[PDB]
Ligand binder design. Sequence first.
Ligand SMILES: *[C@@H]1O[C@H](CO)[C@@H](O)[C@H](O)[C@H]1NC(C)=O
Length: 374
Amino acid sequence: NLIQDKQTDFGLQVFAEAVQSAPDRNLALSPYGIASVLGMAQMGAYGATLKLLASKMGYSLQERGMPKLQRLLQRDLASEDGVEVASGVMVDRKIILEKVFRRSLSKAFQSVPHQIDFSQPEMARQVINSWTSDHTDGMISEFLPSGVLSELTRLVFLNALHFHGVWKTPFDPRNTREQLFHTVNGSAVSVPMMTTTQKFNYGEFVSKDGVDYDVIEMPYEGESISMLLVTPFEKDVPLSALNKELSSSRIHQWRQEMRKISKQLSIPRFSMDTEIDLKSTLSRMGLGDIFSQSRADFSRITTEEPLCVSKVLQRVKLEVNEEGTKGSSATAAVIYSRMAVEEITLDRPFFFLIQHKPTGALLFSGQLTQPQEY
Ligand SMILES: *[C@@H]1O[C@H](CO)[C@@H](O)[C@H](O)[C@H]1NC(C)=O
């Protein structure tokens, strides 16, 4: 809907700032997860800080009927098989919380703020890691490494997501082969390339800046979730040129302009485990003041003292491999055609989006720039 698209757009903007500052690195974020934590921050914000957040995000969770929308969204995504996701706010145990913040987090997120003794950073780390692990079924067992929290840490918003998908149609691992992937370096490296032929939802598009590109869709079993793979046509045009195609409306027009068509698709097998501290990106988006001791207004969290965000952290993890619906065939029925099936091989950096179709939410937005890394 309208506000789903606003969340998707806000999260893709964060994604687009992240890749702009690190064009050569593998990166997976969760637009849903990012909107979720900044939605938590909104519940605590007041005055100019609320106004700032609401204007950058495009909506306000403090407005009538909005907590129920956040809550149903969160409920629908978390209930997907394969999805383990956790968001929460961790606040120093010494701070006296306002009831309104408690009531807001319960109404929109069915959560409570988690009080942490940050004056003992290594204990705080173990407590936060165990909580995150318990709430992701162990899939994110050590959310934070040492050196992130300090004794000065007061308020942390975090989101953790692991996703184990099963393709509707399995890849045959016997069809997986070492083939060359071209990095932004110009260098070529040989990696396992999974391959399959099937009728694929497929479209060709051109960006605003006249860059020609394709998008191809691959469903997980159930078809509530599917991955969209997006890449420049020309092998020597960088992935960067596409950063601004990623909007919820552009995704809407991809879905109505795409049609099924036989294709031989080859894509690297890869895993990503991306940890990100979102300060630098959010500040590039104009949200720097939420981190400022002098300018941030979280009066809804506490009125007894100044308070600004210490950290906004996300960790996202997924493994993309051959696994498909058990006992299903890797291969279509043999239909003869004088039509040569076009090959699409993803042997240069590409975007991948993983979308929940009922809500339209993006569980992931990532770029693969080097398949041999996480
Ligand atoms: C590119 O630089 C050299 C080869 O040109 C290599 O050692 C390095 O790891 C490459 N980096 C990436 C990200 O492919």
